Symmetry: C2
């Protein structure tokens, strides 16, 4: 479970980073 949970945190961080990059992209469009 511990292993499952670690995996989930790593999965979530990855998704988080993907979206943060997207926001940046859009932030530039915006300016």
């Amino acid at each position: 479970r511990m292993k499952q949970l670690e995996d989930k945190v790593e999965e979530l961080l990855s998704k988080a980073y993907h979206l943060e990059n997207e926001v940046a992209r859009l932030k530039k469009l915006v300016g």
Copy 2:
């Protein structure tokens, strides 16, 4: 430990939704 890990997942999920919402605003705002 298990619970610190559960908490971290909860924290990242909430962050990911915050960013999803955000990306959705920006996108509408830009195109």
